[PDB]
Amino acid sequence: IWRKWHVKINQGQKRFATASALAASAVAPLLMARGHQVSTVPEVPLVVDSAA
Amino acid sequence: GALKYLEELSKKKQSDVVRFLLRVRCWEYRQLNVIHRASRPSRPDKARRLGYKAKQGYVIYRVRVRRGGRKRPVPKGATYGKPTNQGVNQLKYQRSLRATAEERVGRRCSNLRVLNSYWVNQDSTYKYYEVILVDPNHKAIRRDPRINWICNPVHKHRECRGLTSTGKKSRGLNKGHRFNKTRAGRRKTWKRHNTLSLWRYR
Amino acid sequence: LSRAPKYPRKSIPHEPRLDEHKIIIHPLNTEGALKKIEEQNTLVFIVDVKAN
Amino acid sequence: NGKVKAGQLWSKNKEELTKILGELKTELSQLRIQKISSSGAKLNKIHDLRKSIARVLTVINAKQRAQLRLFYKNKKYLPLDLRPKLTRALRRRLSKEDASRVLEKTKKRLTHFPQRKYAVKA
RNA sequence: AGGUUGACCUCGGAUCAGGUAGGAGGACCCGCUGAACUUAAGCAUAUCAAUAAGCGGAGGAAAAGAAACCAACAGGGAUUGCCCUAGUAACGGCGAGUGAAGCGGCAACAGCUCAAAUUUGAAAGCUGGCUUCGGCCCGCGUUGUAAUUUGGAGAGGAUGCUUU
């Protein structure tokens, strides 16, 4: 059980990867290449009113 | 009070009066049994400062133990291993003869709890102790808040676990740099220093 | 002095452990018993092992 | 027949309970010989009388113990079977009053300086 | 009656009245006792190891614990445990090796009881037995049970307000 199970990652690298994923989520070709069905989505990124 | 005078007289153990009393009492105790009940403490000041009270449930037992070192129970008194450059005559027991006396008195009276014990006399062969014991099942003991802690099951056989005064002295439970290895428990400290602590995000 | 207890240790005295319904279980229906009935005026029973 | 309900037994007193016990034991002793002599539906009946004897003995014992507890209601020493069982350590444990006894100096200190109810403004 | 009648002290008896101990479990805990294989070219220091086996004693935790402490600072402030101190100070044949602690951050925090005093204008204290539950008895105890005091103080005064 004293095998190394967890990985310690720099928080700066974690934040970098989260920002890169957020930037990639706004690219409509990347959504289709990742497999989402976004052909009927009116705009990317999709922002809905908070009153709803 | 008289007990101040008894304390200052008990400090002078080489005076003529104290040596005479110790001699006659050693004779009496050597012709009595090895373990026998004392009707009252022969050193009332020492018993009182160690916790004895003239209340039902407090018992005094007098005991003599053979003084000196110890010997390993090996055949013909010899070891068949690597040479140790020393004989079995010079091995020292790690607990006191006082602690041995408290254990034997507790085994004799298994229904009581050993509170403390004190030196009363000695000769070339024996050392003599008087042991204070408390009855946990006596109502006078159980109703008194100054002593009813001993009725709890965690204080069963303090003399067998080193929780008496001589046990603390032999375990070295003192504060400071001279007691670095033993102040919190020697084997516990060794296990703490020898454990390998591995964290998740190491 | 004899004992004069302030309370009985056993509140209810126990019933006879070996009474007659436990002593006699059933007779024997074998030909040995049936022969002994006519030739010996003897009845054969199966009884408790602890009964004399 | 021979299946005595416990609701009937809970109203009887000692002597007729012993009489019912005796007649059930007698009929059981007869029907064991009937069992070893022939095969029939009497095996259900011997089972019923065994359970009926058990019920009668249970009712008699319960009433005896209730009467003994009423007799020993106000006495200092009770029989060991009528004393509460708990565990051995629980029986040897200090009573609540002896555990809650405090010294008189402690009583004075807790009387004149207890734990107060307070709050700290932000 | 005095060759008698008793009081204490010590030691005994009882299937006396009431209780308690033993064994199990033993992963963790507190002690005692205690190796060798192994590693040092071999090997009596050493290392394995203050371990395994053996023995005694507890609990849901145990143990420790309110300084005869650390320090040498502008001083910290019971105990325990984690990180760090630190593979450091230090110890060690012919060297293989061994190896803490103060400070600092954190989890959690909690403080107290006796002996040594004359209540002396009143043993004020307590086990047990019987109770009509009001109490009454047999006793323990003055070779000291209550209240008071524990070093942070306290005892005595003075003083005027607060507290239950």
TrEMBL record, chain A:
Family, per entry: Belongs to the universal ribosomal protein uL4 family.
Lineage here is:
Eukaryota, Fungi, Dikarya, Ascomycota, Pezizomycotina
Organism this protein belongs to: Chaetomium thermophilum (strain DSM 1495 / CBS 144.50 / IMI 039719)
Q: What is this protein called?
A: 60S ribosomal protein L4-like protein
The organism's place on the tree of life at top rank: Eukaryota
Automatic annotation (TrEMBL), chain B:
Q: Which Gene Ontology molecular-function terms are recorded?
A: RNA binding; structural constituent of ribosome
User: Does the record bear Cell cycle in its keywords?
Assistant: no
Q: Does the keyword Flavoprotein apply?
A: no
Q: Which SUPFAM superfamilies match?
A: Ribosomal proteins S24e, L23 and L15e
Chain residues that bind Mg(2+) 1: Y80
Give the source species. Answer: Chaetomium thermophilum (strain DSM 1495 / CBS 144.50 / IMI 039719) (Thermochaetoides thermophila)
Q: List the InterPro entries.
A: Rbsml_eL15_core_dom_sf (IPR024794), Ribosomal_eL15 (IPR000439), Ribosomal_eL15_CS (IPR020925), Ribosomal_uL23/eL15/eS24_sf (IPR012678)
**Basic residues: compositionally biased ranges:** 168-185
Q: Which family does it belong to?
A: Belongs to the eukaryotic ribosomal protein eL15 family.
GO CC: one term? cytosolic large ribosomal subunit
NCBIfam families associated with the record: PRK04243.1
Q: Which PANTHER family match?
A: LARGE RIBOSOMAL SUBUNIT PROTEIN EL15 (PTHR11847:SF4), RIBOSOMAL PROTEIN L15 (PTHR11847)
Q: Which UniProt keywords apply?
A: Metal-binding, Ribonucleoprotein, Ribosomal protein
Return the annotated region ranges for Disordered: 164-185
Which is a GO BP term held by this UniProt record? cytoplasmic translation
Positions binding Mg(2+) 2 in this chain are T84
What is this protein's name? Ribosomal protein L15
UniProtKB/TrEMBL annotation, chain C:
Q: Say if the entry is tagged with keyword Iron.
A: no
Q: Which GO terms describe its molecular function?
A: rRNA binding; structural constituent of ribosome
The biological processes this protein is annotated with in GO are: translation
One GO cellular component term, please give it. Answer: ribosome
Keywords noted in UniProt: Ribonucleoprotein, Ribosomal protein, RNA-binding, rRNA-binding
Q: Does the keyword Repressor apply?
A: no
Q: Which family does it belong to?
A: Belongs to the universal ribosomal protein uL23 family.
* The protein's name in its UniProt record: 60S ribosomal protein L25-like protein
UniProtKB/TrEMBL annotation, chain D:
**Which protein is depicted?**
Dolichyl-diphosphooligosaccharide--protein glycosyltransferase subunit STT3
* Signal peptide interval: none
Protein family per UniProt: Belongs to the STT3 family. Belongs to the universal ribosomal protein uL29 family.
Where in the cell does this protein reside?
A: Endoplasmic reticulum membrane
Main role? Catalytic subunit of the oligosaccharyl transferase (OST) complex that catalyzes the initial transfer of a defined glycan (Glc(3)Man(9)GlcNAc(2) in eukaryotes) from the lipid carrier dolichol-pyrophosphate to an asparagine residue within an Asn-X-Ser/Thr consensus motif in nascent polypeptide chains, the first step in protein N-glycosylation. N-glycosylation occurs cotranslationally and the complex associates with the Sec61 complex at the channel-forming translocon complex that mediates protein translocation across the endoplasmic reticulum (ER).
Protein source organism? Chaetomium thermophilum (strain DSM 1495 / CBS 144.50 / IMI 039719) (Thermochaetoides thermophila)
